[PDB]
Amino acid sequence: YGYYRTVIFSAMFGGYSLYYFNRKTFSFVMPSLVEEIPLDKDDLGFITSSQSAAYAISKFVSGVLSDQMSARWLFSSGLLLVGLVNIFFAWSSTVPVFAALWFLNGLAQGLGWPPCGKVLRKWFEPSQFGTWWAILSTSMNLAGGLGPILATILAQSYSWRSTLALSGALCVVVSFLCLLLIHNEPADVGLRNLDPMESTLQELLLSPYLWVLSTGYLVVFGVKTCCTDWGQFFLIQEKGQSALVGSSYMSALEVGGLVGSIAAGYLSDRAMAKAGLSNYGNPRHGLLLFMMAGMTVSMYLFRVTVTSDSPKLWILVLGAVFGFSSYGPIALFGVIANESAPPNLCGTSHAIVGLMANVGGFLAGLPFSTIAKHYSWSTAFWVAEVICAASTAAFFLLRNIRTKMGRVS
């Protein structure tokens, strides 16, 4: 029983790592391209926004579409298309073809996660679902970490064209292997399927739990993005610190976030296993509320206590704590959304919470800068903290509402 779990998890890990590395290879190899071919920063923003829009639209459409077909053909086709796009990028010359191919890459990249989530839910009992979710999700962190060094080393002894071609060929080979290996359903090999304890979209959208979860995810994502974007500006312009302090703060925040995501997954899974079965509440709500309280406390302490005569250790500890308390709930919202949804309508819920995330991420962009430039940065951070506190109070107020979606008996 465990051998198939091991092989499927290994294949998914490799596939997702290749996804992330070939998503970020452009920014990885950017300097050599600039040296060989002149570039204009406006066109760089053009390309980046093109991919951002394509990836968002593809994520939504793939989330909607994943439940209609299998979760293996989609994964393999997505990786094959990404590899083909990266290969064909090596012979492009001008900016428009760059933009078109990179838009196609953004469209292709949307097929990655939903099949993996469906397979993970189908193959794992609830006592290990969140833990293995977080463990698999760490692959993108691993790729983002050990991508640039390899890119620079390879570019030292070869041109960027060869690097892109090799990456594309490797992606195609990995796609073939993943198509060969991954098994979507336990009963397909012939063994006994796990007992899944129908629902229709019309009464799927009429469930208040989905709206509550979406609002919470929007708020937490907005707070995270605003803080991670404007922390350096707040610490430099007003607190009078140095750039090294900001870099160390960012690194500590990332490390704390990784640790928080992993620990949240593990502890939530342990609590779910420990708890009983009922149609009211959810065992992960306690951890979610604790981590949101950590958000609020860390943000208030960072806003108030941190001054111009603060040792670097205080800033590092605050950054690590905020990263922990911020990257916990972000993964926990997705885990809850996928788990609690009806078995045949999970991808739609994932797409809905993703587009809420997109809206929340937008809401912390230009308006935040406008508020900061109007009065000050401290006013903007106070507004963000007040919104976070109100959101966590509201979420705690409704911990006992119906948690299962779909038709109700």
Side-chain angles (χ1 to χ4, degrees), residues 1-34 36-40 43-87 89-155 157 159-191 193-196 198-273 275-372 375-396 398-406 408-409:
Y1 214 81
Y3 265 95
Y4 275 116
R5 279 178 173 165
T6 296
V7 299
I8 297 169
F9 203 80
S10 289
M12 288 208 304
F13 203 103
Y16 205 69
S17 68
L18 268 296
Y19 291 167
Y20 200 81
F21 171 68
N22 269 285
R23 185 194 305 178
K24 293 275 139 205
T25 181
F26 186 48
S27 296
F28 287 177
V29 75
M30 182 36 87
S32 182
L33 163 61
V34 173
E36 180 173 333
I37 299 301
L39 268 298
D40 291 331
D43 285 3
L44 275 297
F46 176 22
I47 298 177
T48 311
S49 295
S50 314
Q51 191 196 239
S52 286
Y55 180 57
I57 280 174
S58 186
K59 186 184 287 184
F60 176 69
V61 65
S62 167
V64 176
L65 187 153
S66 164
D67 270 19
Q68 297 304 106
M69 294 182 286
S70 72
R72 147 195 173 179
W73 290 97
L74 208 65
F75 184 92
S76 301
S77 173
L79 182 57
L80 188 152
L81 266 295
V82 163
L84 281 197
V85 167
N86 290 318
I87 289 167
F89 187 88
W91 272 259
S92 303
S93 280
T94 187
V95 190
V97 297
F98 276 38
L101 288 190
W102 184 257
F103 182 85
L104 267 179
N105 184 288
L107 271 181
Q109 282 259 303
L111 298 182
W113 185 247
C116 296
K118 181 156 141 188
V119 172
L120 195 67
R121 187 183 146 105
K122 201 75 47 183
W123 263 98
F124 276 96
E125 57 185 0
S127 311
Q128 318 165 357
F129 182 56
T131 308
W132 293 114
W133 181 300
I135 284 181
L136 173 75
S137 183
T138 48
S139 85
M140 71 76 88
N141 273 355
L142 188 153
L146 61 83
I149 307 302
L150 277 296
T152 315
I153 297 300
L154 295 156
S157 71
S159 185
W160 49 280
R161 300 292 179 90
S162 297
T163 310
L164 292 151
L166 290 154
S167 188
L170 190 60
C171 294
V172 164
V173 171
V174 164
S175 86
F176 292 165
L177 183 63
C178 280
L179 187 142
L180 171 65
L181 259 183
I182 293 184
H183 286 292
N184 55 3
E185 191 146 10
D188 276 345
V189 75
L191 59 83
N193 187 7
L194 291 172
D195 309 303
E198 311 325 325
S199 300
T200 303
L201 187 153
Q202 195 179 6
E203 71 275 59
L204 171 63
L205 277 296
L206 307 170
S207 62
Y209 196 63
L210 176 62
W211 306 123
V212 168
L213 194 67
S214 294
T215 300
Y217 194 50
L218 187 152
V219 166
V220 298
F221 196 82
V223 163
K224 191 264 279 183
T225 183
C226 84
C227 167
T228 193
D229 291 331
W230 305 114
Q232 293 179 356
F233 279 33
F234 182 76
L235 196 54
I236 293 301
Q237 277 179 29
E238 300 217 0
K239 301 294 187 60
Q241 297 291 334
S242 66
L244 293 168
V245 178
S247 302
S248 306
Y249 169 83
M250 208 60 47
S251 171
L253 195 144
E254 311 266 350
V255 165
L258 187 151
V259 174
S261 78
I262 292 177
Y266 181 84
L267 287 163
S268 62
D269 264 7
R270 196 205 209 262
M272 188 87 226
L277 189 138
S278 180
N279 313 106
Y280 274 40
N282 193 301
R284 322 182 185 266
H285 278 167
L287 212 72
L288 195 68
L289 297 169
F290 283 174
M291 283 184 177
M292 293 177 71
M295 311 265 288
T296 297
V297 164
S298 66
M299 293 177 70
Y300 177 97
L301 215 49
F302 173 67
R303 205 191 47 87
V304 179
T305 309
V306 167
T307 54
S308 170
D309 276 29
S310 314
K312 178 185 226 187
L313 290 173
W314 185 235
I315 298 169
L316 295 177
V317 168
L318 279 191
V321 165
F322 179 83
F324 188 103
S325 289
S326 174
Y327 285 70
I330 280 178
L332 198 61
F333 281 113
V335 166
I336 293 171
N338 197 359
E339 178 145 10
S340 178
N344 52 41
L345 291 145
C346 64
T348 61
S349 306
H350 213 78
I352 289 164
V353 292
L355 59 88
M356 293 297 102
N358 189 359
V359 176
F362 173 76
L363 212 52
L366 171 73
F368 205 89
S369 177
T370 302
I371 297 169
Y375 299 128
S376 54
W377 294 94
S378 84
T379 311
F381 277 170
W382 170 85
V383 164
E385 177 213 324
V386 160
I387 301 299
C388 190
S391 182
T392 185
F395 202 106
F396 176 85
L398 281 155
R399 64 191 221 261
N400 63 6
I401 208 67
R402 194 61 41 101
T403 59
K404 95 192 181 312
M405 283 73 74
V408 58
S409 185

